[PDB]
Design a protein around this nucleic acid. Sequence first.
RNA 1: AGUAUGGGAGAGGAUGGUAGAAUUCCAGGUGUAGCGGUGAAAUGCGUAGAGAUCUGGAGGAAUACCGAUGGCGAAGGCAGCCAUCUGGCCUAAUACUGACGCUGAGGUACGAAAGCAUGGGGAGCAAACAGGAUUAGAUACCCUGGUAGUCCAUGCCGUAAACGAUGUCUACUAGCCGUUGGGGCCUUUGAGGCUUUAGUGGCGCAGCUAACGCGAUAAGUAGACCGCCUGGGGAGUACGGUC
Lengths: 52, 63, 104, 88, 117
Amino acid sequence: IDYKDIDTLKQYITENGKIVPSRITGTKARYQRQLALAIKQARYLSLIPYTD
Amino acid sequence: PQVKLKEGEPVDVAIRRFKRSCEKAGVLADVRKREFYEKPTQERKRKKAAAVKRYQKKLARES
Amino acid sequence: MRHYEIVLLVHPDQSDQVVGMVERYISQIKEADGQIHRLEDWGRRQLAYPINKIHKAHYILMNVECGQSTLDELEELFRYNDAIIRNLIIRREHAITEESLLAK
Amino acid sequence: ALTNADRAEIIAKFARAENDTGSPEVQVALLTAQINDLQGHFKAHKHDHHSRRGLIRMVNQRRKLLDYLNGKDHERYTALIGALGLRR
Amino acid sequence: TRTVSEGVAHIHASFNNTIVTITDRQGNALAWATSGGQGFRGSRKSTPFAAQVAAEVAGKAALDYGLKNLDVLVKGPGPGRESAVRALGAVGYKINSITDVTPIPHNGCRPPKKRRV
RNA sequence: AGUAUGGGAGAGGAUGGUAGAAUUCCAGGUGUAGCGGUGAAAUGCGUAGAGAUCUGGAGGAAUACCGAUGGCGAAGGCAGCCAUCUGGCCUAAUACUGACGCUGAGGUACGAAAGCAUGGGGAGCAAACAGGAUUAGAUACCCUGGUAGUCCAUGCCGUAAACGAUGUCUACUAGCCGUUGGGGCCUUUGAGGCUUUAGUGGCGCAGCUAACGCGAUAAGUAGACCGCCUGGGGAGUACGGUC
């Protein structure tokens, strides 16, 4: 997963803007690490908000 | 959060909905945690006990 | 000779100059060495949060390959340019040339 | 650092036979090249202890291989240390 | 003097006191009330009853400014938040939204030491 | 036991830059009697305008959610993002060397926190200290302030319940259920199921143990080398010596 797939990124973000734990979505650990990294990169690029 | 209102939504029902939203968000838990400083040893002990409890719960629910 | 992916945010008041910026950057990279494997322009996008009281900006993406001196001078130019409000540089393995998502 | 071409050059020079990558001469030459290469790194990053541990491991391995070669054959040992410039 | 139709209500609730402030949009204050002002001195400041009476006082004062629909923002833990927002509706105002906006650090400054009572 | 070639995971280390939330202070706009604190209070702050709220600046320190009985490291330890330099580990098959090994008295390297030296920095917290409470007394626990210190550069110090209270290496000895990084196989279209390997957990047969318990990550069955013990105090103390 890359930081450009904004729709799939929002698929794993709550309404507050926080990352969803892997327990809730059943994601694998290797995919979850990449997902969190891409989410932080998108936050820095300001494609998605930090809070809210 | 941002609990907006329908035309027919009463104030009490709105407040109950807002309480539910805040409880789901769990902001007050983080506020409580921020109040006093906890030693890393205490944090590690608490997390270890929590992990033991979670594994016991999983074992009980499986069998 | 390494591969890099670069994302640049440009002030919309200076979007009329983006052609000069990209032409001089790519010209410098090429005359030094290496090639440009992708150039992309996402347009004038809205920002999730304002930066320096600015609510929209122009997004340019470049997939390039070059050397250390070129990377240093690109850092130099990006830092002391004023239309560039934010940049991200990522080392990559293998060359990416395909039409990326969200480029449209 | 060192590249595949650099390593292949040393292997070809010091090889004792065809496809010989396990000989003490080859191993000692490779370790010597790596040790001489890392000296530049440890001049600018003097407080990098975690990597210095691996450097000492390289040094000790080179010493053990040299002692084994000296035990097996004195002439090869002298020729190798002369070619590589080691003091012992 | 000035006429305003819509405004914001800020509730600062703590473990010791609750403050209700009525402002217009853009953040200029109109009226404010507190438990200490309406008696309830000392330990009594934290009871929901003081919160409700203070909220009623604040709403009554704002009705002189003459606004009907307000947006409610709640900041802080402590009792009397729900009591305060209920009292604001009881004055006959129309609440347009109600949000939770307590600030949360991203692992910032060190908190004070724990109490050994 | 080691070497070459392909692939993989990681808060491993050092240097530099950079992003967002929050605390404090400063200037300003709105606005007016309290705020803060406790078991209850008081010290303290405020009518030369506090607290609340809105906008804009300065500075320092730490990285919410992800986050895990998870990961990496010899141990001490290591968490925002990016680049540069760099160590180790896992995995497949060939090829190569041909015992090149294990342990290790002296020795040497690293080694939390507190502390020391020289020069910087200083938001928050806070030994010493001051004031207010409680108490028969309070020197403390509670409250309001607050210096060193905590941070950075360069060195010293060499100690911790530095703990798995379990030295390092090797081989063998029922099973059942998890989890992390790989390899292979089988279903049949994509998600599953069997194996094998290196880590990390929970039960448990035999065996062992004073008992508690351990039980392929042994405290079982054996081998190689090192360290240490010999009733409780006096005492990790005195004298001598090294640093």
